[PDB]
Chain A
Amino acid sequence: PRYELALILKAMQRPETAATLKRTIEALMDRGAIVRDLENLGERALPYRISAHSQQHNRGGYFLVDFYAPTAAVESMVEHLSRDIDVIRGNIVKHPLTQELKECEGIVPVPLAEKLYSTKKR
């Protein structure tokens, strides 16, 4: 089914970032994934210092890969991303747009619970 790879990349120059992005997309395709879109969220300071592959990273390039892969591909891709030294953090989730929000009428008021205790005179 449809997935989303939130790939935080190392702070590199454009040629190395392009090579890393292509390499990662090629790995997805090799595992049977139909890559749909690639989004650049920009390079920003990490929320906290992340130590990956014996390197301390304070900045990273946030990218998103929208793709369709078979369920078995996910585990294999996770293993590939772990071995890539240019990837700071990589997570695969079920694509959020596939999940449909149920229509909400609004907040229904709940009345005070009654008849909790008998009406005997204490």
Chain B
Amino acid sequence: DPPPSTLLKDYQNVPGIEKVDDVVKRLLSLEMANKKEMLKIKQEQFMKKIVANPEDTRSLEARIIALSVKIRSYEEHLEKHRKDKAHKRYLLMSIDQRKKMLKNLRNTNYDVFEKICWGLGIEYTFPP
């Protein structure tokens, strides 16, 4: 996971935040934020690493990355909450929606599809 000192995605690019007081820095860091704020940074890092245009979020590739970040969050929640049936359904559905996205990407753009699998560590399995 991103270090806790990491600045929030909103305040990371505001000018002069590197010189503010240490109290202000930790107040604007991931430590003092909820779990969703760290997930945004995770998605950002994956988008920059894998996607050619990080700004385009409507591409089939950005949607796969965004869904994979959600999938990982559900797996972490389900690790603590084992009998949460509502979230278990959301995980399995999300996994099935990423398989459909990956199938469409494999059919359209193979070169980019391979990069998604490498960066996100997803193994594409053919259905039974």
Do any CB atoms of chain A lie under 8 A from CB atoms of chain B in the complex?
yes
Contact with B along A67-106 (1 / 0, CB 8 A): 0111100000000000000000000000000000000000
Contact B27 A68 (CB under 8 A): yes
Task: Enumerate chain A residues within 8 angstroms of B32, measured Cβ to Cβ.
Answer: 1, 34, 68-70
Contact B26 A71 (CB under 8 A): no
A residues in contact (CB < 8 Å) with B:
1, 32, 34, 68-71
Task: Enumerate chain B residues within 8 angstroms of A71, measured Cβ to Cβ.
Answer: 34-35
Chain B, interface size category, equals under 10
B residues in contact (CB < 8 Å) with A:
23, 26-27, 31-35
In the complex, what distance in Å separates the CA atom of A120 from the CA atom of B27? Answer: 67
Contact A34 B31 (CB under 8 A): no
Task: Enumerate chain A residues within 8 angstroms of B31, measured Cβ to Cβ.
Answer: 32, 70
Task: Enumerate chain A residues within 8 angstroms of B27, measured Cβ to Cβ.
Answer: 34, 68
Q: Nearest CB to that of A71 among chain B residues?
A: B34
Task: Enumerate chain B residues within 8 angstroms of A70, measured Cβ to Cβ.
Answer: 31-32
Q: Nearest CB to that of B29 among chain A residues?
A: A70
Q: Nearest CB to that of B4 among chain A residues?
A: A70
In the complex, what distance in Å separates the CA atom of A68 from the CA atom of B33? Answer: 10
